[PDB]
Structures are given as C-alpha cells and as structure tokens.
Design a protein around this ligand. Structure first.
Ligand SMILES: C[C@H](Cc1nc(=O)c2cnn(-c3ccccc3Cl)c2[nH]1)C(F)(F)F
Ligand SMILES: C[C@H](Cc1nc(=O)c2cnn(-c3ccccc3Cl)c2[nH]1)C(F)(F)F
Ligand SMILES: [Mg+2]
Ligand SMILES: [Mg+2]
Ligand SMILES: [Zn+2]
Ligand SMILES: [Zn+2]
Lengths: 325, 325
C-alpha cells in the first residue's frame, strides 16, 4: 500500500550512501530509521550481535539527548553520521578498516555533540561554568559529549554494546573517546600536523597512523556541510551564525570577552566562509585525497565550487557596500 | 527516557517467548514490532539475508491484507505466530528443525488467514461464492490465503525472500503451501490419523515424518487459544461465536443449511467449548506431548483447567436457561 514515513523507501536507502543526500527533507523519525539502517547495512548489527531492538532504543535516547539549538542539534548529528556513512562507501573504508574501527567511526559520529549547550568552550571557560570547572578548562564540551554518550550506553536498555566481550568494549570506548575529543577545533592545527607528518609515508599497519586517520575522518564529517549541494549547505551556515551571535550577544551582556568572528557587528557571512573553506576545509580534504583519490571528484569539487560561489558573493557584496557610501 | 509504543521494552521481549503472553494489550504497531523481533531473534534475518527494511514493509503489507473480522483478523494472525514462536523455545525446535523449516513455520503462521471473509468453507461452497467456484470446493479459503500470501511476496518491496536462491524459494513456497492448506479443519481427522500413524515410530530424519509434524505444529498454534491464560482465551471464543452467528444468520436468510455448532439455539457456548477442548484440543496436544514431554505441563495443563472451568460454567448456564424457557 503506502507505508509510514519510518519505513524508508528503496530510493531513500540508495541515496543515503551519497554526500548529495538532502538532510532537510526528513523528520526525526525518518532520520532515526536511516541511522538504524546504516548499522544493519554496514554489518555492524551482525558482527557485534547488536540487539536490533536495543539499537532503536539507543538511537531514540541519543536523539532525546541532543538539545534544540540552531546548529548543534539532532539534524547536525544526522549529517555527520550520514557523511561518515557516505565516506565508508566512497573510499571503500571496509577494505582498509576492521569492523571494530567502522563501529567506532559511526558511533563517535552520532555521539560527538551530545547535549551541546549552544555556547562554545571559550564561553564555558570565560564564564567559569560548571562544565569548565568540572573539566578544568580542558575541552569541556567534547569531554561532556563523550561522557553523556557513555552514560546513555551504560543504560542496559540502550547498551548496543551489550554482547561485546569486555576486551572489545575497552577498545571501542578508547576509540570513541579519542575521536570525539578530536573534534574540538582548538586542536585542529595540532591534529592536522600530526596527520601530515605520518602522511609522508603512511602505513595502514601502524596503529598510530590509523588513529590519526580516523581522527581526520571524523573531523571531516563534523565540518562537512559545505561538501553538500549548495541548497543543502547554505542554510547550515545561517544556523551556525545564529548560534554564534546568540553567544556573543550574551557575552556582551554579561561583560565577557567577545570573539570577532562571532560578533554581529563584525562578521559578513560570505567573507567568513571564504576563509574557512579556503584555509580549513580544502586543505584538510586535500590531505585525505592522497590516500583516497576519489575524494577529489566527490568532495573537493563541491568545496571549490562553494569557494568560488562565496568569493563571487563577496565581490557583489563589496560593490554593493562601496556603492552605499 | 520514555520510548514510544513501537519500541518494545525488554520486559515485553522476554514475555513474548511464553504462551502466557497477553495478546490483547497491543496495538497493530506493537504487534508488528513483535513479529519483526521474532524474525531477528530466531536468526531468520541473518540466515536468509532478509533486508531488515523489507521485513517491516512486508509485515505492514500483510497487516493491511487482514480484514476487520471479529476473529479472523490480524490479531489472530499475531497469536498463531506468537504461539509458534513460543513453541520453538518450549520444545527447542531449532535442535530438530533446519532454519528453512523454522522460516516455513513462522511465515505460514503469519500468512495462514490472509484476507479471510469471515465465513468458513462450508458457507463458500454452499453459497457457490466466487471463491468456491475458483477453487472447485477444495479448501477454498486456505487456497486463497496462500494465493494472497504469494501475491504479496511477489511485490519486490515486500519480498522478504529476494536473497534466497531459487531452489530455496521453491522449497519454502512448497512448505508454506502445505502448512496453510493443512489448517482447514475439514482435514483434521485425516491429518491426525496420518500423524499418529507415523508416531508409532517417529523418525526426525524422515521428510514425510517432519512434514506431518510441521502441519500438526501449525494446526496446534492455529487453535491454541484455550492454552493461554483464561483471561486471554475467553474473549477469543466470543469473537469466533460472533462470526459464527453472523454466518448462521446469513445462511438461514438464504436457505442454506446451518452447522449445529453455529446455531444460536443449540450452541450453548460452554457445551461447545467443552466438546472442542475434549475431543480436538486435548487429544491433539496429547499426541504431540509424546514427542515433546514439556508440552504437557505448559499447554496440556491449562487445557484441563479450561475444560474444567467450562464444565462449571455449563451447569450455571443450563440452570439459567431453564428459567428463560
Ligand atoms: C565561523 C564560520 C565558519 C566556521 N564553520 C564551522 O563549521 C566551524 C567550526 N568551528 N569553527 C570555528 C570556531 C571558532 C574559531 C574558528 C573556527 Cl574555524 C567554525 N567556523 C563562518 F566563517 F562565520 F562562516
Ligand atoms: C468454534 C468453537 C470451538 C473453537 N474453539 C476455539 O478456541 C477455536 C480456535 N479456533 N477455532 C476455530 C476457528 C476457525 C475454524 C475452526 C476452528 Cl476449530 C476454534 N474453535 C465452537 F465450536 F463454537 F465451540
Ligand atoms: Mg562538537
Ligand atoms: Mg483459516
Ligand atoms: Zn559537530
Ligand atoms: Zn487461523
């Protein structure tokens, strides 16, 4: 007949494997079925004896623990995991990674921003929040996301890892913590350097090489919005700014220091994006391309187009402002 | 948190294995989830590579094809499948049957009453309905349930067998057809005789022996209401009498004969149930017990209690009907 929304159609199931997937077309229920499909499809349910019902509860609990922020919400979570999913396919990651690593990658992606408050680490630290005090100023947000992820997993009804022997649990947990903590942008240069270092003569047998690679992969997915089609990507930039502005406005009010890139009276969307794409996104994806050449066509291409589009957009903006004076 | 109904709680999943499960507490969605869980739990999704999403679309389509009769509806379908599932564990059937047999048993239980009109074969035949004409008075309803079952599986989106090699499909199809046709009570004596004949020296390696055992298994589940707790079983009896009175009514105003056990003025519920329990249910489960001894305490027991309760009800009922005269 005509099946409910939570029963993905075979077209959806197919499109889900590509970075082109339009993440705005679905409601939480549908997004949850997509995430559920990914675990079955990647063979994770199979290889780790994941109780199919526990998987649904775990995903619903994860969903319940994401806040209603303009950017750091459940839909962003879906994007990251969905891009990680596309990359497993595009790069044929199952050929180079064990199932244990694929599991670490996917679960970390889904949990990386759990219970995000909507104010970055700088705000937590300057305002001396409970999180900043709890984590001694060390990546308070990322530490918290990871802690909430394991508190959820510690709930028996949500423990998708219930049938994994303790030695495997330890390995997975250590892997997730490492990846989630690797998403704090304050460590971007640091991580990128370590990767590029190993990249000179990459060894898929070297555990430290693989760890860095996995860190780079989750970082890619986390800030992979601009890799998506222009219509899918643009709205996210507005959501992010909306969140940054809310923070700066609050910092202005409470008398805390304000970061220029988050100040309403200073940031112009186009100009800012150009710098981000040009000096953060493109460079990072170029390094990944050396290992997975198919990335250039599938992900570097859209990044270049985005850079161009925004560079043009700025010219139009400058001329417009130049004319108003 | 507090999950939606379609997410079975771990308590429900546990209960689903026992014949004491309360089949009335659930809405189609929860029942659909239960059936899905059964296919994963028994290892069918795993061993036959059933696409987990197709499994759900299929269950939804099956549901859509059951009518809103008072007895022969989707909830009856859930009962039979659930009793079958319970029997698998009670009798440790996976030690005696292959996964293909289990798949045959489970899928046949679920499909055995598809698109039932609410009027039995005797009516179809006597009224010379389209079905009786189509199937030449040979188990018309059962033949139809079968046909519908395979028209459904013919739809790609609902074909839970799409990944089974053709030889496996044929074996499964043959098996399901045999079990569904075996539910026609007109053949009850025939089948019980043939089974008891083989029972004189049962051979688990003899294919004919196993065929009859599976037919007895599905017949057992099909009419196993009285095995369930009294609170669960009695409402089913009333639901059936509702259809029976609907038929006997229509048969009288059409000039077609009426089966005494369906005649309101002869079918004192208690007297009819006592007979059914004593000469159909008990004898059947009795022979099955000789093969699986544990069946006596778990299913033959409640049948005795049930037979005894209806006998008490009969006394009080006849007394009150004497005043009505
Ligand atoms: C600041 C944004 C661009 C941007 N997009 C991100 O996803 C992101 C993640 N972290 N950061 C970030 C945060 C703080 C400091 C530096 C950066 Cl790079 C980001 N900056 C814009 F240019 F306005 F569009
Ligand atoms: C129809 C009832 C007897 C009876 N009791 C059941 O619990 C039960 C379960 N399934 N069936 C059943 C349903 C459809 C066709 C045949 C049967 Cl046998 C039953 N029939 C009576 F005769 F009125 F007392
Ligand atoms: Mg984060
Ligand atoms: Mg029937
Ligand atoms: Zn993020
Ligand atoms: Zn039936």
């Amino acid at each position: 007949p005509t099946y409910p929304k939570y029963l993905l159609s075979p077209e959806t199931i197919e499109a889900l494997r590509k970075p082109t997937f339009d993440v705005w077309l679905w409601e939480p229920n549908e997004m949850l079925s997509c995430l559920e499909h990914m675990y079955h499809d990647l063979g994770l349910v199979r290889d780790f004896s994941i109780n199919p019902v526990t998987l649904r509860r775990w995903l619903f609990c994860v969903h319940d623990n994401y806040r209603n922020n303009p950017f750091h919400n459940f839909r962003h979570c879906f994007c990251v995991a969905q891009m990680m999913y596309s990359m497993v396919w595009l790069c044929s990651l199952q050929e180079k990674f064990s199932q244990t690593d694929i599991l670490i990658l996917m679960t970390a992606a889904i949990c990386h921003d759990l219970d995000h408050p909507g104010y970055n680490n700088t705000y937590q630290i300057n305002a001396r929040t409970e999180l900043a005090v709890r984590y001694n100023d060390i990546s308070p947000l990322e530490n918290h996301h990871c802690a909430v992820a394991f508190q959820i997993l510690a709930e028996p009804e949500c423990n998708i890892f219930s049938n994994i022997p303790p030695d495997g649990f330890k390995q997975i947990r250590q892997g997730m913590i490492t990846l989630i903590l690797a998403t704090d942008m304050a460590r971007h240069a640091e991580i990128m350097d370590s990767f590029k270092e190993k990249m000179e003569n990459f060894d898929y047998s070297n555990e430290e090489h693989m760890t860095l690679l996995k860190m780079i992969l989750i970082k890619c997915c986390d800030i992979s919005n601009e890799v998506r089609p222009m219509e899918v990507a643009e709205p996210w930039v507005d959501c992010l700014l909306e969140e940054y502005f809310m923070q700066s406005d609050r910092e202005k009010s409470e008398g805390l220091p304000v970061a220029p890139f988050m100040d309403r009276d200073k940031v112009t969307k186009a100009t800012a994006e150009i710098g981000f794409i040009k000096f953060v996104l493109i460079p990072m994806f170029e390094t990944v391309t050396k290992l997975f050449p198919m990335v250039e066509e599938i992900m570097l291409q859209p990044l270049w187009e985005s850079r161009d589009r925004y560079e043009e957009l700025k010219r139009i903006d400058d001329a417009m402002k130049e004319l108003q004076k």
